[PDB]
Coordinates of C-alpha atoms and ligand atoms in Angstrom, one line a residue:
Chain A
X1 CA 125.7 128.1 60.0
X2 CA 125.8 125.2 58.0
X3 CA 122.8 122.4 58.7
X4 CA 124.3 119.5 57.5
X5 CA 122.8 116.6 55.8
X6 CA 121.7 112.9 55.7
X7 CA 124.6 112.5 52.9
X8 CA 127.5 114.1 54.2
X9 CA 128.7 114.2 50.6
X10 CA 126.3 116.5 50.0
X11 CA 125.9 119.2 52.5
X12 CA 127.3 121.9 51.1
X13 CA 125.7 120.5 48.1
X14 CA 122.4 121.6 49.8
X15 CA 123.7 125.0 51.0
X16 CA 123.8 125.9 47.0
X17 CA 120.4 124.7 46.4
X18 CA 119.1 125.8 49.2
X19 CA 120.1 129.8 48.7
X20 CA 119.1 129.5 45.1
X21 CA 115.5 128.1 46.1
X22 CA 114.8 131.1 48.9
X23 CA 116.0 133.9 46.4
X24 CA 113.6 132.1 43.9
X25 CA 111.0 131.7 46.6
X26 CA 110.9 134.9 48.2
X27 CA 111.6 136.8 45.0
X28 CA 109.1 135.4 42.5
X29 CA 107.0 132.9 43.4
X30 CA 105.0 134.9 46.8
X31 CA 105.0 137.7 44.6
X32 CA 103.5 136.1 41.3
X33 CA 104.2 133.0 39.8
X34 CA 106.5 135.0 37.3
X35 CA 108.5 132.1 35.0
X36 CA 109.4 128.9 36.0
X37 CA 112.6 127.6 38.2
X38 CA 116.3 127.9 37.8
X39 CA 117.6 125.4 40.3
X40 CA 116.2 122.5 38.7
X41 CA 119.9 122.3 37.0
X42 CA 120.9 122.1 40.5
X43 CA 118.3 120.4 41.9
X44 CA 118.5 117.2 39.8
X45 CA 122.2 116.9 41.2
X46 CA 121.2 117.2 44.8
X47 CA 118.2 114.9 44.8
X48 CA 120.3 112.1 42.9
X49 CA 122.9 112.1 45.5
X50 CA 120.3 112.5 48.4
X51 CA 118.9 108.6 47.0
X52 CA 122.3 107.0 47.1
X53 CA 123.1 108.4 51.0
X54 CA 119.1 107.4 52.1
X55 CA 119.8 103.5 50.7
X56 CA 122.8 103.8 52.8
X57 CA 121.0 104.1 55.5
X58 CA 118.1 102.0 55.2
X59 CA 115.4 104.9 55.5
X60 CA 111.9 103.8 55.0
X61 CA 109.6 105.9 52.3
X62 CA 107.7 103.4 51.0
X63 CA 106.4 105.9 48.5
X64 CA 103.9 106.9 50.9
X65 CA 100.9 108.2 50.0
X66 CA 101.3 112.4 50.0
X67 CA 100.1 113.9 53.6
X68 CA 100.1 110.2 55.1
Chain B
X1 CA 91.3 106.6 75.2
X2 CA 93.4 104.4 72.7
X3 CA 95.0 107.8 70.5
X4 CA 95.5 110.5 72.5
X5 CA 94.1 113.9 70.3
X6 CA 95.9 117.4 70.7
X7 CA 94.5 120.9 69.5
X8 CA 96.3 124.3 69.7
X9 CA 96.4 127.4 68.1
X10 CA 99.0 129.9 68.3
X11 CA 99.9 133.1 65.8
X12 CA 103.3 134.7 65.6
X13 CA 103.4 138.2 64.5
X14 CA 104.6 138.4 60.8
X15 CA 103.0 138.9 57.5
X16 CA 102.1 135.7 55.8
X17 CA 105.0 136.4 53.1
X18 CA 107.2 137.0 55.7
X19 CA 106.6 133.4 57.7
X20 CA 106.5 131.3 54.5
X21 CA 109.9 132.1 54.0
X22 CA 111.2 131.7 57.0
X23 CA 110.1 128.0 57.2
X24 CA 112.8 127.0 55.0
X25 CA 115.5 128.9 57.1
X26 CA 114.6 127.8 60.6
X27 CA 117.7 125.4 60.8
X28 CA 119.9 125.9 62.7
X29 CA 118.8 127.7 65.3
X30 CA 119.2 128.0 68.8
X31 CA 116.2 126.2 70.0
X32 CA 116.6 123.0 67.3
X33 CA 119.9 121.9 69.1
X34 CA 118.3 118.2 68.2
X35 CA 117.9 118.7 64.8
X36 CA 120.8 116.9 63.3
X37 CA 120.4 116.7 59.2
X38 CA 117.1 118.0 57.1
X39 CA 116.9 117.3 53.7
X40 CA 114.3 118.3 50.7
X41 CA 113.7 115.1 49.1
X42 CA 110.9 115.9 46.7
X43 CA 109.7 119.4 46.4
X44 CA 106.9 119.8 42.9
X45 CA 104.9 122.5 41.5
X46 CA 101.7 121.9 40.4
X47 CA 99.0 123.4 38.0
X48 CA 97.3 125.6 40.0
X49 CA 100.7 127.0 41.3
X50 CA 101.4 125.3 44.7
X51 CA 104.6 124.1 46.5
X52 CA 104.2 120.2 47.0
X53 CA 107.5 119.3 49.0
X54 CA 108.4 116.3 51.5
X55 CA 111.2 117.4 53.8
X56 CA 112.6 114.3 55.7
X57 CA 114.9 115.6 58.6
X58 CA 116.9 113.0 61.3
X59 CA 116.6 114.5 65.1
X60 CA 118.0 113.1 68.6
X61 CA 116.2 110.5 70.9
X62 CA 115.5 111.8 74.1
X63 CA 113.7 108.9 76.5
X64 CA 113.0 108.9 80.2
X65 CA 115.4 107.0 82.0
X66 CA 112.4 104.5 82.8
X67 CA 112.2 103.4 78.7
X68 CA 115.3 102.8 77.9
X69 CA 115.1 100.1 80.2
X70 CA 112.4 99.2 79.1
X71 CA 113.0 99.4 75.2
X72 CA 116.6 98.9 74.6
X73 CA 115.8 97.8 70.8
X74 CA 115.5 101.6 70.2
X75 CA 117.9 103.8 72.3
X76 CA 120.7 104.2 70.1
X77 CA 118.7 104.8 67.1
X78 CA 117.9 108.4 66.2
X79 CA 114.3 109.4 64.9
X80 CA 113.4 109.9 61.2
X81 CA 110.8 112.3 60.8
X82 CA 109.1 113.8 57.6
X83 CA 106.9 116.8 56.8
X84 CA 104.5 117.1 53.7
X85 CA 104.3 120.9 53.2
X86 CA 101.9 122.4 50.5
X87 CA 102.2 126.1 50.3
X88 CA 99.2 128.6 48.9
X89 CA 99.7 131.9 48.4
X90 CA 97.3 132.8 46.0
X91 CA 95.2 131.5 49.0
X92 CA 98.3 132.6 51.1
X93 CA 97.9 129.7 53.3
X94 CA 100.2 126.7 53.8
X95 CA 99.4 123.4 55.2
X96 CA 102.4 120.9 56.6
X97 CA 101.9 117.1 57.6
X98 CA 104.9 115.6 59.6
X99 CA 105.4 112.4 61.3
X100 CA 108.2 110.1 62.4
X101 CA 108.9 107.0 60.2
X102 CA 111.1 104.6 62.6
X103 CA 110.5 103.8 65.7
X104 CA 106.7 103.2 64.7
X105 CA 106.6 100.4 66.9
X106 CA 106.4 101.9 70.2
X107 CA 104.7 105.1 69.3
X108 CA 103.4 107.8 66.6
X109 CA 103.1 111.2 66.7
X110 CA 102.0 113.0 63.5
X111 CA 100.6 116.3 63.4
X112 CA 98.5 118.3 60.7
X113 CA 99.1 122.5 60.8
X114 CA 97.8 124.7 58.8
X115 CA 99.3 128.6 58.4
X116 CA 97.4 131.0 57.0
X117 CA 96.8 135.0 57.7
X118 CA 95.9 136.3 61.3
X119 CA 92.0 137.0 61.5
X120 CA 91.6 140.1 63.4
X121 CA 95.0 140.9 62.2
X122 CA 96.2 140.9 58.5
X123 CA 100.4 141.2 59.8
X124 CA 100.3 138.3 61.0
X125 CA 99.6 134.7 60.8
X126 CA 97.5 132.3 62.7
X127 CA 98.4 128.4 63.2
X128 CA 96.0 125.6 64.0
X129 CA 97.9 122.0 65.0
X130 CA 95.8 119.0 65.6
X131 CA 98.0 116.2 67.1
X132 CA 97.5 111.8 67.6
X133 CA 99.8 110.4 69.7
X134 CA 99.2 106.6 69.5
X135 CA 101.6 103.5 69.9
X136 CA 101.1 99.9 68.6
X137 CA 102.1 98.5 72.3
X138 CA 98.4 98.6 73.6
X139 CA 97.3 96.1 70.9
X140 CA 100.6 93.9 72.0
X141 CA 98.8 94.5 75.5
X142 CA 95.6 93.2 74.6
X143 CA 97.8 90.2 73.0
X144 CA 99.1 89.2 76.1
X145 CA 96.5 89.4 77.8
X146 CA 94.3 87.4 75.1
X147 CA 97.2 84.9 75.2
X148 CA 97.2 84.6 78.9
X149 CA 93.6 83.7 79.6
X150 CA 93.3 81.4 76.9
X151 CA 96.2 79.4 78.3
X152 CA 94.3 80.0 81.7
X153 CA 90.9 78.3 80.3
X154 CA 92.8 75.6 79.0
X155 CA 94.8 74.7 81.9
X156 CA 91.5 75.5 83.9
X157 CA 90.4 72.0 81.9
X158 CA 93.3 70.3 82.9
X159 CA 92.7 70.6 86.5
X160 CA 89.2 68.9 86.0
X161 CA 90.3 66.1 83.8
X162 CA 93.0 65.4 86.5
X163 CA 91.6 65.8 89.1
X164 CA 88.5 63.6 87.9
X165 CA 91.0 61.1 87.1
X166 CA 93.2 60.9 90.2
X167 CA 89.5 61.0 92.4
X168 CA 89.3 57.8 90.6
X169 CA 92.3 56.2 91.5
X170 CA 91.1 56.5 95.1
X171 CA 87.9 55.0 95.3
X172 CA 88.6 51.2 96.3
X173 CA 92.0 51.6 96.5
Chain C
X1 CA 75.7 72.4 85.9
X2 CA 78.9 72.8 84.4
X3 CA 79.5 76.7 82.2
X4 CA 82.1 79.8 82.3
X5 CA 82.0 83.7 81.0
X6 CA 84.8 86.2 80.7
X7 CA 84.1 89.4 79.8
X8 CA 86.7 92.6 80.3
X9 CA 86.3 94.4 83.6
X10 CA 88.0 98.0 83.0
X11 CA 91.1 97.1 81.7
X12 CA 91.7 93.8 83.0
X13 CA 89.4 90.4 82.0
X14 CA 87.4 88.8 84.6
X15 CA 86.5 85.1 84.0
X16 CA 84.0 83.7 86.3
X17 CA 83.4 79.7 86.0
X18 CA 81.8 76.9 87.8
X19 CA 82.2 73.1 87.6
X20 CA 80.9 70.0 89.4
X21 CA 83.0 66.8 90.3
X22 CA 81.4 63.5 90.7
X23 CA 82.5 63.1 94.6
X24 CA 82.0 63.5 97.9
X25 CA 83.8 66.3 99.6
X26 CA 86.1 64.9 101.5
X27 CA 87.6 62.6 98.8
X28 CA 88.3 66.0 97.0
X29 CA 89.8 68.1 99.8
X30 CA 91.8 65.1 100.4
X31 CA 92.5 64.5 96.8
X32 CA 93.4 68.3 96.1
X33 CA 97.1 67.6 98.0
X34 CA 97.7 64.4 95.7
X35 CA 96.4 65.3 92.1
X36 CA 100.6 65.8 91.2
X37 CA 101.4 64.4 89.7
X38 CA 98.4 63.1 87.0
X39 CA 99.1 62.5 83.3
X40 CA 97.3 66.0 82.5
X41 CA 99.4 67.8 85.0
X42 CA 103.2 67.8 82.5
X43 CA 103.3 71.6 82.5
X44 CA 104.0 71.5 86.5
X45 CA 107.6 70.6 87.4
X46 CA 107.7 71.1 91.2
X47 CA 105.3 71.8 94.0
X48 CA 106.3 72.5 97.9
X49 CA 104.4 73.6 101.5
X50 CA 106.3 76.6 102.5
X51 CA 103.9 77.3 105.2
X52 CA 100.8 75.7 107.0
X53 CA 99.6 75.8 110.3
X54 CA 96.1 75.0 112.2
X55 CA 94.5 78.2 113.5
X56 CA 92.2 78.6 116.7
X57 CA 89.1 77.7 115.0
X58 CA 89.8 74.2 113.4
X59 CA 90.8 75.4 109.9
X60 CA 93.9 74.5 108.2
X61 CA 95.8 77.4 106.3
X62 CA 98.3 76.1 104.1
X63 CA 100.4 78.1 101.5
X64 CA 102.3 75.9 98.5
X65 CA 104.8 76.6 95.8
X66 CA 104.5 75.5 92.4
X67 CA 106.8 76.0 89.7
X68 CA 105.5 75.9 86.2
X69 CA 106.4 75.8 81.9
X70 CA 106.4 78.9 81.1
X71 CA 105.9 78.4 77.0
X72 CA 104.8 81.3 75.3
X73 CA 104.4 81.4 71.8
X74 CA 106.4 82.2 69.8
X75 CA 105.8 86.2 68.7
X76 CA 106.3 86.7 72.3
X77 CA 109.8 85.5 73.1
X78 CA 110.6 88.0 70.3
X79 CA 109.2 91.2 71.8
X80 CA 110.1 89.9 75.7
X81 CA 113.5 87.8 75.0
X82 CA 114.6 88.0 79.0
X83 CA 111.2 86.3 79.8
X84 CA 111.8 82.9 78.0
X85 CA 114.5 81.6 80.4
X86 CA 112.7 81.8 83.8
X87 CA 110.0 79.1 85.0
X88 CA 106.9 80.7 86.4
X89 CA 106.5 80.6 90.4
X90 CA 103.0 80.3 91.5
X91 CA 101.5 80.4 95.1
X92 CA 98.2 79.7 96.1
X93 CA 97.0 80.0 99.6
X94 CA 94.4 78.2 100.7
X95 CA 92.0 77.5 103.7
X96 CA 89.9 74.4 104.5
X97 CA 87.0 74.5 106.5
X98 CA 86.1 71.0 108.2
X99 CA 82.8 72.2 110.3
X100 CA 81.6 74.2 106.8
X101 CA 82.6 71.4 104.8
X102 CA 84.1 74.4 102.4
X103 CA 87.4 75.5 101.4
X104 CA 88.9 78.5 99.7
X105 CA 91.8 78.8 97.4
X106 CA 93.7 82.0 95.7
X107 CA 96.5 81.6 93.2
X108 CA 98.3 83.5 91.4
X109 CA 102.0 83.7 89.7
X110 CA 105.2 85.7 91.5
X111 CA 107.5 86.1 88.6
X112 CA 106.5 87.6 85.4
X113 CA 104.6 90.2 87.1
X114 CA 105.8 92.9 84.9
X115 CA 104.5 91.4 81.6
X116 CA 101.3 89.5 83.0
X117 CA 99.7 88.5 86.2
X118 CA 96.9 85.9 86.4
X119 CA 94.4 85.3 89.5
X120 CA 92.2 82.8 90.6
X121 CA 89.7 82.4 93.6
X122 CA 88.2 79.3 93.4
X123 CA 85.7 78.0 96.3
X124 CA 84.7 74.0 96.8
X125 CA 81.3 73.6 98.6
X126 CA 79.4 71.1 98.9
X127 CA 76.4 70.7 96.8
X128 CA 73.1 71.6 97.1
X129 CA 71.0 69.8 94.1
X130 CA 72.9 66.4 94.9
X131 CA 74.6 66.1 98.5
X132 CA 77.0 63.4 97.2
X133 CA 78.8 65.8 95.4
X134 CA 81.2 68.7 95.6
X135 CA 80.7 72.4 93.6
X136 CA 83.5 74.5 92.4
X137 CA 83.2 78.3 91.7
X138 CA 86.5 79.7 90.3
X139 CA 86.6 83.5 89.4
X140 CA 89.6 85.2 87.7
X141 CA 91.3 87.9 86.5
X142 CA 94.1 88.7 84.4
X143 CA 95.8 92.0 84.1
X144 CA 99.1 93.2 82.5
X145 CA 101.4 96.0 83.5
X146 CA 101.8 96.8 79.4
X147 CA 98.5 98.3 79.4
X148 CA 99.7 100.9 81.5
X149 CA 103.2 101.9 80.3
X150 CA 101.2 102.0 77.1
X151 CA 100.0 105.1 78.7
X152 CA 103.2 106.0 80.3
X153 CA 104.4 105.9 76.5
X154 CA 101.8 107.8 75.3
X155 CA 102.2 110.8 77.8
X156 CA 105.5 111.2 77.4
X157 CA 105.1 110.9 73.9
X158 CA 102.9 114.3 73.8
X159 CA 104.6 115.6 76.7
X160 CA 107.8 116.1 73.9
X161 CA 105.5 117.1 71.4
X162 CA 104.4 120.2 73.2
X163 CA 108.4 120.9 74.3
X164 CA 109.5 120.3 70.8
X165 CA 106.4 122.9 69.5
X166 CA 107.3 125.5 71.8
X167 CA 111.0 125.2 70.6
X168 CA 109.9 125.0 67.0
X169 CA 107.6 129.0 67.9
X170 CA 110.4 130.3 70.1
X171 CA 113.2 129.3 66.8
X172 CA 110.8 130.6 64.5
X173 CA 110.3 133.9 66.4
X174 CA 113.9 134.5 65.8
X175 CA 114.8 133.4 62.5
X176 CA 111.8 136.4 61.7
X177 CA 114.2 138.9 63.9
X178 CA 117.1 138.3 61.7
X179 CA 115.8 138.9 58.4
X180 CA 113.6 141.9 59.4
X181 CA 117.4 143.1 60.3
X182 CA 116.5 143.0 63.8
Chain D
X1 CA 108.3 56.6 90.2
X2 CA 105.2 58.4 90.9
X3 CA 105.7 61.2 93.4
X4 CA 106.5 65.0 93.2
X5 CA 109.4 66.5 92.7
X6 CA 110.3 69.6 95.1
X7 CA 112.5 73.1 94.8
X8 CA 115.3 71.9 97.0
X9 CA 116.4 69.4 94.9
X10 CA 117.8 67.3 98.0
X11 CA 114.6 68.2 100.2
X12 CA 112.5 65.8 97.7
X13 CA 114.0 62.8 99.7
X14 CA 112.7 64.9 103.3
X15 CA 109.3 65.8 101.0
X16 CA 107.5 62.9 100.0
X17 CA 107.4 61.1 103.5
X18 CA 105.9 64.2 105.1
X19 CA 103.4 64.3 102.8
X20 CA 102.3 60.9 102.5
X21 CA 102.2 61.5 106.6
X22 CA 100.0 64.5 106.1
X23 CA 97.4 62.9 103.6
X24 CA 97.1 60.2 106.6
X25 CA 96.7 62.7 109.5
X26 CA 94.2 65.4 106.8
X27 CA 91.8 62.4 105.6
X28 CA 91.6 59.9 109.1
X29 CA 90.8 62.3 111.7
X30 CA 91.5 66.0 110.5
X31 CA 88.4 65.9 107.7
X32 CA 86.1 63.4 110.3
X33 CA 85.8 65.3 113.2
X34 CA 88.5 66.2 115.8
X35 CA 92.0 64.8 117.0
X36 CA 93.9 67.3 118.0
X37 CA 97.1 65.8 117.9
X38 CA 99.7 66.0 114.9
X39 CA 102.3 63.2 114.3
X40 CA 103.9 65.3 111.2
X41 CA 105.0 68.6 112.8
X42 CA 108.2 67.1 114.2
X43 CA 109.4 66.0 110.6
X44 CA 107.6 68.9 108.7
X45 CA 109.8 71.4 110.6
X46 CA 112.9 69.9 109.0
X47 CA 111.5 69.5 105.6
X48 CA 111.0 73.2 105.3
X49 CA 113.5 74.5 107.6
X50 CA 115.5 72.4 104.3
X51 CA 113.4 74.5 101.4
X52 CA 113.8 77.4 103.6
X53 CA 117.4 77.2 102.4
X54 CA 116.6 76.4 99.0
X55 CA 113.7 79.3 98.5
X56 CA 116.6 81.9 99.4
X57 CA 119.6 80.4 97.8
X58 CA 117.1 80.4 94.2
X59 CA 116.1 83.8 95.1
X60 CA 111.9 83.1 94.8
X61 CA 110.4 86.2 96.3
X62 CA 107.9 84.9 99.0
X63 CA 108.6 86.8 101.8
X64 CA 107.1 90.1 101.4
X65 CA 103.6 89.0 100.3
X66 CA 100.3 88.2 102.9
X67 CA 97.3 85.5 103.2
X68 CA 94.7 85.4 99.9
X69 CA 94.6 89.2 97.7
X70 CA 95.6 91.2 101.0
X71 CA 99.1 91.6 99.4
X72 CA 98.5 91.0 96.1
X73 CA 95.2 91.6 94.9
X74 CA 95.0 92.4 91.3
Ligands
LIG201 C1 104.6 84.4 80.0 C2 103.7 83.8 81.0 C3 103.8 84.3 82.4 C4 102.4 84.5 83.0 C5 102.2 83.6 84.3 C6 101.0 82.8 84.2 C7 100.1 82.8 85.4 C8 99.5 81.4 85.8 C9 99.8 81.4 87.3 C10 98.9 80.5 88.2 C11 97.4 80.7 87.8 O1 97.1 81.8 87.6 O2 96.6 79.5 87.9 C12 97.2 78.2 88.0 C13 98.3 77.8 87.1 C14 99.4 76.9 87.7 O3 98.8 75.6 88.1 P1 97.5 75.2 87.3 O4 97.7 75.5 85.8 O5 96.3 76.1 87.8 O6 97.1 73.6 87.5 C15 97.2 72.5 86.6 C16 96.1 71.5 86.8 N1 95.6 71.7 88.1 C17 96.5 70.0 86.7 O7 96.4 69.3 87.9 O8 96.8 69.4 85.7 O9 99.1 79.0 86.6 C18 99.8 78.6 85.3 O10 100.0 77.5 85.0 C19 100.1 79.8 84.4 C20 101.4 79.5 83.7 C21 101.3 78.4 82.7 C22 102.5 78.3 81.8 C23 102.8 79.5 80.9

């Protein structure tokens, strides 16, 4: 069931912001644009920790421009 | 021709709301056995309420047993990939951007989709692709073969200039 | 007169060259087994006769063996490492003519042959503007085996792509079946 | 001193003779007209029948390959 992730600290970690983010998603955000997102508390944990484990491992993003 | 050029269209039979979704929740399955991590490392929303987000996801190298040989540098090294996704639904139409980031040197593959509704059918969803495989290694091969005939035209001049001078060393002894 | 061209045939180059030398002909058939060594010729380290013999007709056919520097520069012994060890083998087979007063060489190298291969057929005739001297056409072509693996690298490359996309319908087929319950 | 080397590093000493016998058969009477007689067969046969070792025991890959672009041609 569970995907892992590049930071193996953190792949659980994902598992929780993921779920939020569909239920968010699916729920108000297809439907209408509604109000404004509730896993950014969450969020802002997981991307933090996603940094460290990608400088880790060396992994490229140069910034790169958006769509190439 | 120097960047091979792929086109296809498929649909898959599912409302537009219904698909969207799902392309968060593909992994695991089944099929993606080489799929090893995927992560969401930026996801924004913007003003005119779209879904910017750059998934970066790690899968397995599988080469034929010919390139391996031929490219040890990169057999033990798994392939980073990442996938630009904007998502539209007051459009209801989302279009993803995805290409690997290592193992540039020997080859790219990078592919532009675009989802949007079915249209002869409005439960489900069409998909254009467009694809460009390329690889650096057919400049190197020009290289080479730069690098060899100039070597060639040089040592064609060498010839000459020794053979004029030993010719020289014959004539009356 | 003395000039050379190249320009790329297909995939390959073809260079196409001629040259004059200041000599009669026989000097320089007889002088083509002694130019090594000669202070341009450093880059050569050995040379042998493997194989001659005199055929029916009165021409000689002789086959030699050098062995030459390979020295490559230098952003090439990073991408091909196993090739800066080995010395290039070259043969060139060759036939003189005495009754034609012409002779005919082909070289080319027998190691490397994956990463380059270099040809040359050169023909020394005698001329025809002077008659106290000796033309040389030389024609050549070098090809490399990268340019097709490039391909081979390239075709598998989409081959995978199309397996991976089919993989990526036929998991997203099902993913749909278990949230529409199913 | 002046001469070439050769592949079978002893074979340089059966070589250079051989050679320098050949240049004096090719240019006296091979080039001008006809003699038809070789002095240098009987001492070219050891010469090679020497590198004939040496071509194998270095592992250079001439056998297998024909006259002018027959074998190889590009
Ligand atoms: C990596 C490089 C591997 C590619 C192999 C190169 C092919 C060259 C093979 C033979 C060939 O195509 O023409 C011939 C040459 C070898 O003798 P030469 O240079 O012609 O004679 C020197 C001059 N005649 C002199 O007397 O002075 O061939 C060469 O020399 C080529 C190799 C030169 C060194 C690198």
């Amino acid at each position: 069931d569970k995907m892992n992730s590049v930071g193996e600290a953190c792949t659980d970690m994902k598992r929780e912001y993921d779920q939020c983010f569909n239920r968010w998603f699916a729920e108000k955000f297809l439907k209408g644009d509604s109000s404004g997102d509730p896993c950014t508390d969450l969020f802002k944990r997981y991307q933090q920790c996603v940094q460290k484990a990608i400088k880790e491992k060396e992994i490229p993003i140069e910034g790169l421009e958006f769509m190439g | 021709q120097m960047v091979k050029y792929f086109l296809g269209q498929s649909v898959l039979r599912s409302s537009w709301d219904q698909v969207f979704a799902a392309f968060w929740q593909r992994y695991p399955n089944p099929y993606s056995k080489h799929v090893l991590t995927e992560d969401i490392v930026h996801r924004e929303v913007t003003p005119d309420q779209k879904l910017l987000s750059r998934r970066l996801l790690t899968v397995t190298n599988r080469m034929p047993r010919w390139a391996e040989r031929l490219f040890p540098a990169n057999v033990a090294h798994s392939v980073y990939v990442l996938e630009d996704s904007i998502v539209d639904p007051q459009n209801q139409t989302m279009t993803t951007f995805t290409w690997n980031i290592n193992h540039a040197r020997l080859m790219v593959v990078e592919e532009r989709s675009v989802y949007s509704v079915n249209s002869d059918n409005s439960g489900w969803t069409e998909i254009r692709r467009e694809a460009w495989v390329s690889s650096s290694l057919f400049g190197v091969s020009r290289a080479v073969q730069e690098f060899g005939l100039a070597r060639f035209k040089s040592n064609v001049t060498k010839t000459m200039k020794g053979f004029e001078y030993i010719l020289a060393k014959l004539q009356g002894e």
